[PDB]
Amino acid sequence: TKQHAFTREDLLRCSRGELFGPGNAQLPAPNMLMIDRIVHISDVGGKYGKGELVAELDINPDLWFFACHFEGDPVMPGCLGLDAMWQLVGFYLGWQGNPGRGRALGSGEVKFFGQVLPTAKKVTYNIHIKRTINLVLAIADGTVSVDGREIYSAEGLRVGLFTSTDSF
Amino acid sequence: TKQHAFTREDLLRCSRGELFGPGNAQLPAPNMLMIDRIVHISDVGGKYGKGELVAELDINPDLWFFACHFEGDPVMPGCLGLDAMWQLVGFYLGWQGNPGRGRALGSGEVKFFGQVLPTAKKVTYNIHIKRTINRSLVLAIADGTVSVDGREIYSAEGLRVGLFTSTDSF
Numbered sequence: 209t210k211q212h213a214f215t216r217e218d219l220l221r222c223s224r225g226e227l228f229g230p231g232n233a234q235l236p237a238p239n240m241l242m243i244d245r246i247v248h249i250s251d252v253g254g255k256y257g258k259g260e261l262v263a264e265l266d267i268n269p270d271l272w273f274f275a276c277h278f279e280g281d282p283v284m285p286g287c288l289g290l291d292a293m294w295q296l297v298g299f300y301l302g303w304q305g306n307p308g309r310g311r312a313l314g315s316g317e318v319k320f321f322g323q324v325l326p327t328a329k330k331v332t333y334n335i336h337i338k339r340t341i342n343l344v345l346a347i348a349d350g351t352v353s354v355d356g357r358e359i360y361s362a363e364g365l366r367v368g369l370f371t372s373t374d375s376f
Numbered sequence: 377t378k379q380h381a382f383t384r385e386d387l388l389r390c391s392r393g394e395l396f397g398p399g400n401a402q403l404p405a406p407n408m409l410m411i412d413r414i415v416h417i418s419d420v421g422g423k424y425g426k427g428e429l430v431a432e433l434d435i436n437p438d439l440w441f442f443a444c445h446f447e448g449d450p451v452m453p454g455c456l457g458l459d460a461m462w463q464l465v466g467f468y469l470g471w472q473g474n475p476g477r478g479r480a481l482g483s484g485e486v487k488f489f490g491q492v493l494p495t496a497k498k499v500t501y502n503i504h505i506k507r508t509i510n511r512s513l514v515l516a517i518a519d520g521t522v523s524v525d526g527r528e529i530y531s532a533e534g535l536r537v538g539l540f541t542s543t544d545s546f
């Protein structure tokens with residue numbers, strides 16, 4: 209709960225276990241990492257008064273998922289945009305100083321009503337923390353947007369921290 | 377609606393547009409493809425009388441996602457297991473002979489209550505078709521489970537996939 213913005217290099221440090229420390233929350237490394245930068249994170253304000261994350265992924269035509277998904281119909285997988293939102297809620301719990309390794313526990317309603325094409329410039333994630341239950345877990349609502357346009361929503365994103373993940 | 381099982385080589389042909397034809401449903405190619413084989417597909421019977429899919433992914437410690445998810449703590453991303461279930465509902469709509477390209481529309485409740493480690497042998501997907509809507513838009517609603525080595529680890533209610541003769545809405 210010191211830094212309120214993180215750079216790509218900060219996020220790669222996190223993926224190595226070197227931001228929050230060994231045994232604590234880690235972002236995935238490439239090619240599962242679906243965030244370039246966290247432009248803002250806070251534990252106050254947001255839609256519910258329990259904090260907010262705003263993060264960005266830069267798009268170019270050469271990103272790996274465009275060639276295989278699908279052949280002659282390139283589109284960013286919806287599952288990876290949803291994953292970015294789980295990734296961010298895990299980051300939030302680690303950023304708050306809780307111990308242990310992140311697992312996605314699932315979500316309420318998810319809706320896809322738009323897409324990320326290879327001609328897009330930038331994906332923005334808006335995450336509104338709804339509740340932290342202190343085993344340690346966060347509930348959040350999120351949206352995925354591409355160059356200003358909302359395309360995906362998730363209600364009741366759930367992520368937990370595990371001080372032993374072997375009971376799972 | 378002749379063939380009730382598909383090999384990995386059949387799924388790759390699908391990913392090239394060569395199973396259902398150009399402009400119709402497509403599986404992803406590697407490395408977004410999360411299915412090795414469709415063991416069973418049918419459009420009658422099943423939990424709701426609209427058929428079922430059973431499909432498998434072989435697990436080994438070298439699958440790409442274990443190295444980066446996470447360093448020192450390898451676990452199959454839950455989002456890829458969910459994605460396999462959306463890809464299977466898309467496949468079903470194609471296999472029924474509907475035209476157009478597939479897009480996932482989303483899900484009701486998803487629960488992850490176990491995990492796939494790099495020491496596992498096989499992931500199995502069970503998809504129960506609940507409803508197909510054949511109006512202005514071709515749509516399927518389904519329930520799904522992901523299991524690893526016999527144990528149920530994920531559930532999804534109200535998986536929704538559509539076929540688009542033009543995906544220009546999105």
Ligand SMILES: CC(=O)NCCc1ccc(S(N)(=O)=O)cc1
Nearest residue numbers: 285286287401466467478479480
């Ligand atoms: C096999 C088939 O028709 N697939 C199309 C359905 C389909 C499934 C998943 C996604 S995603 N990864 O963008 O969430 C898109 C389309």
